[PDB]
């Protein structure tokens, strides 16, 4: 019963990480709802946050698998954020 | 996360493991549990040398990632010229 558990998370979870709440004067934009978090994301919900809010306000302008004792999905999302920011960065400069 | 929250249970120690092969595994755990949380990092007889293997192998990164991601030694240098 390991291994089925395993395959609904699996499943329930592609939609969530094809897509933290938006709203419609940046800083109300998107904000983390506090309830609904993972609570092994816990230790980087503001650097997920931040990493898809940087690419939204260059857009309007022009894989993860969970494994126990094992960050291997840990470091896949600050492999992204260091990439998420040089874009935006950059478009600044 | 060193002085504590790790203690070894006297009491389910199994028989057939010497009282200093348990504290060789207290320490190959806890050398990658805090490798992991805090230094911010992720990577019989053949039964002796496994712990013993899991143990010069382990320990050994961990002075590495504490000496070229932090200088470890190069602060007690610094620690004596001015603090001393």
Not at chain 2, 9 to 17: D, L, N, Q, V, Y
Not at chain 2, 61 to 76: A, F, G, P, Q
Request: glycine residues 2%; contains cysteine; neutral net charge.
């Amino acid at each position: 019963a390991q291994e089925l558990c395993l395959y609904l998370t699996k499943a329930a979870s592609a939609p969530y990480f094809e897509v933290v709440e938006e709203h419609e004067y940046w800083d109300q934009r998107y904000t983390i709802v506090q309830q609904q978090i993972p609570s092994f994301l816990q230790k980087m919900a503001d650097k997920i946050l931040s990493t898809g809010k940087y690419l939204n306000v260059v857009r309007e302008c022009g894989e993860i698998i969970y494994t126990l004792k094992e960050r291997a999905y840990v470091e896949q999302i600050e492999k992204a954020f260091n990439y998420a920011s040089k874009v935006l960065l950059d478009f600044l400069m | 996360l060193w002085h504590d929250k790790y203690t070894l249970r006297k009491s389910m120690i199994p028989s057939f493991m010497t009282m200093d092969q348990s504290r060789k595994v207290l320490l190959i755990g806890k050398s990658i549990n805090f490798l992991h949380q805090v230094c911010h990092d992720q990577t019989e007889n053949a039964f002796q040398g496994k712990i013993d293997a899991a143990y010069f192998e382990t320990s050994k990164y961990l002075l590495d990632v504490l000496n070229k991601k932090y200088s470890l030694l190069d602060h007690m240098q610094a620690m004596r010229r001015y603090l001393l």
